[PDB]
Design a protein around this ligand. Structure first.
Ligand code: CA
Ligand code: CA
Lengths: 189, 189
């Protein structure tokens, strides 16, 4: 039997990638499926909601968050109606904060196809419940899952997949021409 | 470019295994870490809660659910005080119901260590929100994650890992001697 040190700090998540996610929102119970272009160097993130067959939702959005310019564009994918809004909130990366609490390492999957991952949190002894848990791969530190009990009880779980390093198509961060735009509230049905 | 049929039915999850889980309960915000012995053939499941350093919780339980006998034993791991209770609810396997809606297939992880998985749900067009989403491996159909918006807004996400087929230690389903026991309500702090 052998004794593995707990890691002194967490691995460093990739800075740029193209991937896909599911965002599960318990306040609404909604699962949102999106293609994501993520760039922590410029602190921008582009989210393209996906439509599946016969979902009861008519409206689907593209989001372009440009934190270095304190603006977010939201575009109805059909109408192409744009909303330009101010971003007050600071950038938040998909990574493990360097002061996170190490929780575990384990294998996801079966024999012959299993992947080692690590789990980290913001657990400390002064607080009964964590607000953040992250599951990242051991080998490349890619995000796998995060749950965020953030926002005073407004919680989400995000699952990450089909991630590919780098950004093959930068143009996605250019807002469309219809984005000579004002600050409308666009929400889904 | 190529066109993959959607699967006509889902893969068949393993019937017996030993593994570990994290159960994230939004009603409380709690993350419970447990070692699990799972047996769908006898419809029994043994859950052993894990204690981590300096969690503010004093009480940790072992559960032995024996659905074929409509009884569940709950044991305080320290005191060894047992509770024997009646099970009214039918067995529910960790599997994909054969009438589930196929949602997606994708790779978790990075280049050189990534695992293909499938996602299934209980989505139908008559209901805005799913009550159940399951993520299972393609290769062996091992559970990876489930979220359950079951119970009229009482929702959980479960993550599965370190799964090994078969049950190396059957004795765990034998209740301990202190289980000449009554029906106490034992809850955590
Ligand atoms: Ca973050
Ligand atoms: Ca089930």
């Amino acid at each position: 039997h052998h004794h593995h040190h707990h890691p002194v700090t967490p691995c460093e998540a990739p800075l740029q990638w193209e991937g896909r996610i599911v965002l599960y929102d318990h306040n609404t119970g909604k699962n949102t499926r999106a293609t994501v272009t993520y760039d922590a160097i410029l602190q921008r993130i582009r989210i393209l909601e996906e439509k599946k067959s016969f979902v009861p939702c008519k409206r689907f959005f593209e989001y372009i968050f440009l934190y270095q310019e304190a603006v977010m564009f939201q575009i109805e994918q059909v109408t192409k109606i744009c909303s330009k809004n101010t971003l007050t909130e600071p950038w938040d990366p998909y990574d493990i904060p360097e002061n996170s609490t190490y929780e575990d390492q384990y294998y996801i999957g079966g024999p012959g196809d299993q992947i080692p991952v690590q789990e980290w949190s913001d657990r400390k002894p002064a607080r009964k419940y964590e607000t953040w848990v992250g599951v990242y791969t051991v080998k490349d530190c890619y995000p796998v899952q995060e749950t965020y009990t953030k926002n005073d009880s407004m919680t989400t779980s995000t699952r990450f997949f089909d991630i590919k390093l780098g950004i093959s198509d930068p143009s996605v961060f250019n807002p469309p021409s219809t984005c000579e735009a004002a600050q409308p509230l666009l929400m889904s049905g």
